[PDB]
């Protein structure tokens, strides 16, 4: 995929969900479908647990490498954490390419 990630022939199934409808006060027959419904909404919890496989790095590089570090100067707030109002802040886009390898 042009946007990064893993291309899959059979990716994780789509999980759809909806609130089964409950009719309002109907009082007479009509071969026409009922259109009066009680307004409802649902809430709940969802837990998703993934397992990943990792590829250990085994380099014989001598000098030190580059790492992703929390390098800010004169921080007025902590990144990746909620601010005064309770809104989550994220000022950086952390990628994945930090370690190196001799081509």
* Residues found near a copy of itself in the complex (CB under 8 A): 20, 22-23, 25-27, 41, 43, 45, 58-72, 74-86, 94, 100-103
Q: How far apart are CA 43 and CA 17, in angstroms?
A: 11
Nearer to a copy of itself (CB atom), residue 52 or residue 62: 62
Terminal Cα distance for the chain, rounded? 24
Structure tokens given for 98: 């930090």
Nearer to a copy of itself, 48 or 94 (CB): 94
User: C-beta of 79: minimal distance to a copy of itself in Å?
Assistant: 6
Question: Rounded CA gap, 68 and 88, in Å?
Answer: 20
Pick between residue 30 and residue 71 the one whose CB is nearest to a copy of itself: 71
């Amino acid at each position: 995929p042009a946007m990064g990630g893993f291309g899959l022939k059979h990716p994780p199934p789509m999980m759809l969900i909806k609130n089964t409808p409950v009719p309002g006060n109907i009082t007479s027959f009509s071969d026409v479908p009922v259109s009066s419904f009680i307004t409802q909404y649902s809430t709940g919890q969802v837990t998703v647990e993934m397992e990943w496989e990792l590829k250990k790095e085994n380099s014989k590089r001598w000098n030190p490498e580059i790492q992703y570090t929390n390098n800010y100067n004169d921080p007025q707030f902590v990144d990746f954490a909620p601010d005064g109002s309770g809104e989550y802040r994220t000022t950086r886009a952390i990628g994945t390419r930090y370690l190196t390898r001799p081509l």
